[PDB]
Amino acid sequence: LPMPLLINLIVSLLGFVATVTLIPAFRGHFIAARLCGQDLNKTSRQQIPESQGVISGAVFLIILFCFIPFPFLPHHEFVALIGALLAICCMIFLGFADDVLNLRWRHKLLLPTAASLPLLMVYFTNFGNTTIVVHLDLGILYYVYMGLLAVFCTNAINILAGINGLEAGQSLVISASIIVFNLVELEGDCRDDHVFSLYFMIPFFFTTLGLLYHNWYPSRVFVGDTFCYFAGMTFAVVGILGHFSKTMLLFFMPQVFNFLYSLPQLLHIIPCPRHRIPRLNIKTGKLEMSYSKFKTKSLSFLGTFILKVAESLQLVTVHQSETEDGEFTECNNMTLINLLLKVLGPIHERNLTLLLLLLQILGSAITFSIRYQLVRLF
Amino acid sequence: LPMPLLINLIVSLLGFVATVTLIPAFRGHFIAARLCGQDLNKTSRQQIPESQGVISGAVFLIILFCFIPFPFLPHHEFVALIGALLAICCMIFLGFADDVLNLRWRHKLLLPTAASLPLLMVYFTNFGNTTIVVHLDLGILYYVYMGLLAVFCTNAINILAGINGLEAGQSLVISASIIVFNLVELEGDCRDDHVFSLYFMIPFFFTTLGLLYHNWYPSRVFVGDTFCYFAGMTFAVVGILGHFSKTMLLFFMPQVFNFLYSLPQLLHIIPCPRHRIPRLNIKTGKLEMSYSKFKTKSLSFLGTFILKVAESLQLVTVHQSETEDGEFTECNNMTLINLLLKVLGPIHERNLTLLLLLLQILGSAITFSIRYQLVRLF
């Protein structure tokens, strides 16, 4: 176990160097490829290369392809290693294809379930435990869970974005938490399930680190949806094949909140604008809250209920107004980023991200305290 | 053996239908993505979607992902099935990324060797025969062969192009030849190596058929380099893991000629222009030969030798001229397409491709006649 992990750490560090180096090397290619855009929360109108998650994702694959013989230098764990690499590779591919082509939201949800198929087949051939603990055999519903886990993690990361270094940053906190957890649980009982998880988590961390080097404020590159697809599948891969998917979903606490808080807007029960990202006040330099103003008559009975319950829960800022066109309701954009600006006022982009990363650390500490009996201590 | 092959044929036919249907469905996406271009050998200036090999390649992957449990419903042949799918998937990905980004020719040659790594690792873990028959153990040089085989097949297909339905068409003749060969050799001796090859060749044939449906004259879509990368790796995958790589390289006869005949121009020993494709005479409707005119003084001593030897072999048409700038030499563009126009005069695009496809059939018949003792018959 320490001998292949040493080799895995060496290739991961070479991969960090590789990502840091290749990202600015391909800058010209992405700009020429029209795979670039402006940073909307910035006064600068310069084009920044998009989908850089494709370069770190590619570096990740090559690193692991080289690593493949070392754990071996038994097949049951080897099939899962090649199978997991197929599922991740397919996802980086279909992820980048979705970035380049901008597929319909319905086709976007099918892509993660498509890429997760080899894991389901490996779990089938290697006779994986279809039973779950509250002792219940899910059988077919367990395979539906595995399929949907890839779809969840990607979109959970993808919905909690809009400020520089958030998507890559939250993934670093999550992967580092899994790394810490794997090491703690490596000492005894489940050694095989946590050594396997480390094999993917260490290269994922260091390639993402190299990406964050360029994505961090002030954003030099964008990660793109390719990164969210890549990250989401890597987390689903380790959680599924490591059997710690429940523990792993607890590291997704800020994402789960942000998702449910967003849900009334996403389902269009409460009016949703094109972009729910904060509005930068040029004179301040900091980011202010964004709003979704709409006609009160056009709002549904269910929507009027949810918006009144969320206002009474002290989560949404509601501003009533009346114009020549009629009466309009200015509802606060429902996302964790805008909720932090409601609670703490206007915050600068670099501090706002860092704060959400700290919030991600807090949740991980909460998970760890539950799992290891540290509630009495703290 | 017939039971999983039946299921493989069913999914392959559904895949044909899928490719035929999805290609025109995504037309809008590619045009908007600026992933489109004009057909240079045509008077029509309309933009035709590029890289459609990504859609057939994707359909291929999904088909095989569904197929994975059926041969099983033993691991040694399963590892190669998942391993081969990883190598092919990685290639479709890095292939499409190269289409979208247009990487340097030196990085383009590293991509196939990168994607072929899982096959090398599977061949390593599953203790593959490093020995070869003229009885010689190549050891390390055998792994270099496997790595370079992917690079060869892709580029061999990629260099023999320039007319509608050639790249997809030549791949259909090659894959159909391998299908026929697998079936002949399935009856006895090596059943496992040919049943494995069929598992990939049948889905490759029917997805390419669906692509050719739209690529065939008059080209509605372009296959892109994504297809050449995809095709090349699938042929290298089956040849390597099926151990019939020598027999398979004989089906690549028109490609091997076209490559070597092109070599003096590619290496720039003899001047090479931007495009060595035929020139369409608007009044004729047919395609005429293309030429590479250059200064005789700028031509190397080795280049003057090769061009004189190729002229004496009755392969290249050389036209000497003298202008105000000085004396210039108008050399014929060295490719199998232009050589066919030198021998048979101007030919229409639809007939020219069909003729090269027939030429590909001839070579396959030659290979089959050698392998099965049919020289006396014909």
Numbering used by the authors:
A (entry chain A), B (entry chain A): 7 to 79, 91 to 151, 162 to 405
What did the publication describing this PDB structure actually write?
It catalyzes the transfer of an N-acetyl-D-glucosamine-1-phosphoryl unit (GlcNAc-1-P) from UDP-N-acetyl glucosamine (UDP-GlcNAc) onto dolichyl phosphate (Dol-P) (Heifetz and Elbein, 1977, Lehrman, 1991). The DPAGT1 structure (as reported here and by Yoo et al., 2018) consists of 10 transmembrane helices (TMH1 to 10), with both termini in the ER lumen. The active site is on the cytoplasmic face of the membrane, formed by the 4 cytoplasmic loops between the TMHs.
In the crystals DPAGT1 is a dimer formed through a crystallographic 2-fold axis, with an 1850 Å2 interaction surface. Comparing the WT and Val264Gly structures showed a small (1–1.5 Å) movement at the C-terminal end of TMH4b towards TMH8, which would affect both the dimer interface and the exact position of EL4, which forms the top of the Dol-P lipid-binding site. The entrance to the catalytic site, between TMH4 and TMH9b, is open and accessible from the lipid bilayer via a 10 Å wide cleft.
